[PDB]
Design a protein around this ligand. Structure first.
Ligand code: ADP
Ligand code: ADP
Ligand code: BEF
Ligand code: BEF
Ligand code: MG
Ligand code: MG
Lengths: 733, 66
């Protein structure tokens, strides 16, 4: 460890142009009380200050006031490199300007008042870009050094000419934001960030390493992946981490209404990137530029593609520029633009894992008065399919929920704002839980499923079936250590079969509500279209949305219409659907861990090519309920009902042997209908006896006579031959 | 190569390449990645692909003994 790098500490000396080192630091690095030292911090910024012996400092980190600390874009507890510069000498002239909001109210001679006594006889060591502070006249004004004559940094001796102007600006706040954000604001993408940093650092600063090894540096990088991942943030961080030129052009803004000058715009962009310095070019949204040369019909876009191909190929060794192109979809790319020489190093910035979600959480919400009872580990563990911007939307929705929560009771008084509510603001766990329950992933927005309030105790019976189901779904998405220690490839599909009215759709709803993962549901023949190619493109982009928001559950309901038996046809469309489903279901490796759930009524018409072991091997039979399962169904269907205390369901469980949950629900609904009819008759009788008093309801519970009248027309659902067919299929399989 | 023939100038490029290979010497032409030029003519729906396939057909057929 070279002792030339030190951390930022609080300031004892309240002066602007000063830093404090300890004496044991002075003997460790020769410097003095008058010595003017160059501080170079993060964000590629610098500053100049006077070193002074400080006993309290302790050699390891340095004291600097908040003004110096700001110019370096550092905080208390950040590292900076310190090194002396006496090459700097007395100024010829200086160019400071007051920031508008620090002078709103006053006017007149700022020089005589603030600047004159501030710089006098101190010969301060200033810098271009510095923003210093001067206290006087019952306020503190902030000026920004806009220009000096003696290079970037100089000293303000009494002979130095201080020029101030009355240009109150707003620009510094805007200037800080664009420069703001470097490489510490992007979390969860460490390998791609290191590769991008290498690709912008090594060919641009020192090509001697690549000349020594003998590998030609690439002059082009492509960024693809899901939307809202961080390609634009990476481009902004790369544009801010270097003070070189950054010619920013976009996709559809290179055109013009005159007779063919977009080629001249591309030529002038390339010549302005070539004229100044070895620089970097970021071309955003190249899908509007490259139409893949197949679905285009014009000549102007082909001339644009040819001009960009000629301007991308003709780069010599003395040019030394690289290009960055952000791209949403990775399939509509021109293979002539993907030729060897222009775009070769394609990075894959995918969805983050739990540690990446923790990194983006600790990046985003660390700039607020947050809470006192928060744990981000459970928030990152429960969240599965979010990527990049959805976490920021979650934090914004939590802040808006906190604002809605602390408004109706504390009386904000929207005509004029107070100062009592503003400091008592904390986004607690309840606002984050409400924001988690009131949001959705950005890839599953168009396939949003309406909320069905069912739990794992609402499905009466099927106890061992539901516990092995919740185990075999909860295993491969949260704890992969048992999967790694087992050493066997897992199942990537499951199927339900049995009589209708048994609980397959109810088990699918219980998966959709209480599995702590994502869920996407389609109907059977919904993914078919009369056009050509769309009937397979629907399955293709549905499975693309499934692979994007990993993990998820794709419930293919009623597979007797998609996976129809082949067996003279209508043209071969269902065969194309089955083949597309087979080639989109066979590309399931250990990554992206999706799960396909099927539930049919007739299992004889399912394709053996899709019932093959290795594609969809599991087969859970859901049989008819027994006595105890029927009692559990009758107890779970009567949960939120005002039942009679002197009423038992064991007689209903014993008197019905071949019944099912659907007709049991029909029995309970007919009993409720009879109770509602009795309530209506008692209400109209009470109205007649009042016009010509009981309780709030004359029938507060469902009596035994209502059940005895509802079970009078209680048929059964399934016949006898269907049970024989299902028993024959269960004996065959 | 295949998709480096486009910019009515694909037919001019095909005629230019064939007359250049016929003018100089008895030689050999390498056409790499023919699947872009020949889209199998039934699944395609464009018209400059049909025109450049017809041009390649009438230019490959028009080679004599000399
Ligand atoms: N990987 C990431 N890490 C941190 N913040 C991210 C990430 N991806 C996206 N964001 C956040 O998403 C918001 C907008 O992202 P943006 O750069 O516009 O997305 P993109 O690169 O897809 O165009 C910003 O608030 C940004 O901080
Ligand atoms: N085992 C069960 N426990 C509780 N309710 C059940 C059960 N089986 C069926 N039901 C009821 O049946 C109704 C519809 O059943 P559903 O799942 O759609 O049938 P299927 O098995 O044909 O897909 C729901 O109102 C549900 O409450
Ligand atoms: F990937 Be981002 F939405 F550009
Ligand atoms: F969905 Be069930 F099998 F009627
Ligand atoms: Mg973008
Ligand atoms: Mg169903």
């Amino acid at each position: 460890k070279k002792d030339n790098m030190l951390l930022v500490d609080d300031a004892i000396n309240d002066d602007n142009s000063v830093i404090a080192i300890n004496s044991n630091t002075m003997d460790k690095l020769e410097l003095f009380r008058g010595d003017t030292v160059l501080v170079k911090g993060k964000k590629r910024k610098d500053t100049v200050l006077i070193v002074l012996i400080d006993d309290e400092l302790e050699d390891g980190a340095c004291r600097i006031n908040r003004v110096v600390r700001n110019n370096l874009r550092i905080r208390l507890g950040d590292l900076v490199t310190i090194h002396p510069c006496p090459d700097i000498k007395y100024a010829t002239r200086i160019s400071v300007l007051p920031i508008a909001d620090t002078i709103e109210g006053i006017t007149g001679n700022l020089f005589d008042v603030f600047l004159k006594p501030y710089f006098v006889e101190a010969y301060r060591p200033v810098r271009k870009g510095d923003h210093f502070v001067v206290r006087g006249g019952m306020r503190q004004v902030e000026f920004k050094v806009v220009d000096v004559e003696p290079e970037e940094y100089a000293v303000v001796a009494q002979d130095t000419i201080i020029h101030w102007e009355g240009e109150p600006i707003n620009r510094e706040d805007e200037e800080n934001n664009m420069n703001e954000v470097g490489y510490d604001d992007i979390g969860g993408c460490r390998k791609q960030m290191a590769q991008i940093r290498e690709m912008v650092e090594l060919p641009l600063r020192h090509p001697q390493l690549f000349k020594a090894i003998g590998i030609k540096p690439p002059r082009g990088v492509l960024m693809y992946g899901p939307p809202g991942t961080g390609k634009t943030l990476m481009a902004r961080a790369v544009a801010n981490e270097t003070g070189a030129f950054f010619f920013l052009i976009n996709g559809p803004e290179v055109m013009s209404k005159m007779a063919g000058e977009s080629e001249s715009n591309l030529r002038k962009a390339f010549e302005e990137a070539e004229k100044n310095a070895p620089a970097i070019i970021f071309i955003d949204e190249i899908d509007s530029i490259a139409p893949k040369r197949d679905k285009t019909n014009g000549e102007v876009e082909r001339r644009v593609v040819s001009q960009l191909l000629t301007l991308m190929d003709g780069m010599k060794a003395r040019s030394n520029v690289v290009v960055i192109a952000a791209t949403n979809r990775p399939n509509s790319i021109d293979p002539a633009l993907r030729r060897f020489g222009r775009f070769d190093r394609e990075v894959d910035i995918g969805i983050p894992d739990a540690t990446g979600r923790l990194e983006v959480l600790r990046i985003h919400t660390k700039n607020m008065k947050l809470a006192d009872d928060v744990d981000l580990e459970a928030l990152a563990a429960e969240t599965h399919g979010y990527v990049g911007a959805d976490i920021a939307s979650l934090c914004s929705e939590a802040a808006m929920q906190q604002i809605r929560e602390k408004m109706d009771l504390i009386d904000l008084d929207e005509d004029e704002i107070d100062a009592e509510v503003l400091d008592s603001l904390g986004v607690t766990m309840d606002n984050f839980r409400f924001a988690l329950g009131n949001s959705n992933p950005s890839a599953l927005r168009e396939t949003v499923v309406e909320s069905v309030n069912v739990t794992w105790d609402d499905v009466g019976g099927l106890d061992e079936i539901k516990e092995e189901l919740k185990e075999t779904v909860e295993y491969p998405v949260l704890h992969p250590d048992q999967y790694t220690k087992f050493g066997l490839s897992p199942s990537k599909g499951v199927l339900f079969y049995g009589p209708p009215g048994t609980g397959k759709t109810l088990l699918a709803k219980a998966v959709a509500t209480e599995v702590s993962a994502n869920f996407i549901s389609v109907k059977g023949p919904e993914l078919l279209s009369m056009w050509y190619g769309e009937s397979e493109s629907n399955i293709r982009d549905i499975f693309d949305k499934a692979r994007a928001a990993a993990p998820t559950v794709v419930f293919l309901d009623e597979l007797d219409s998609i996976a129809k038996a082949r067996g003279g046809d209508a043209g071969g469309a269902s065969d194309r659907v089955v083949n597309q489903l087979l080639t989109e279901m066979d590309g399931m490796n250990a990554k992206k861990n999706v799960f396909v759930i099927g539930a049919t009524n007739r299992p004889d018409q399912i394709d053996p090519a899709i019932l093959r072991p290795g594609r969809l091997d599991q087969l859970i039979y859901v049989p008819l309920p027994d006595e105890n399962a029927r009692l559990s169904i009758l107890n779970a269907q009567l949960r939120k009902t005002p039942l009679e205390p002197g009423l038992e369901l064991t007689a209903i469980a014993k008197a019905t042997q071949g019944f099912s949950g659907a007709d049991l629900l029909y029995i309970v609904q007919r009993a409720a209908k009879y109770a509602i009819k009795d309530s209506i008759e008692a209400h109209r009788q009470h109205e007649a006896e009042k016009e010509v008093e009981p309780e709030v309801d004359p029938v507060p519970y469902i009596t035994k006579e209502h059940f005895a009248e509802a079970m009078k027309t209680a048929k059964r659902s399934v016949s006898d031959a269907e049970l024989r067919r299902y028993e024959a299929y269960s004996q065959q399989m």
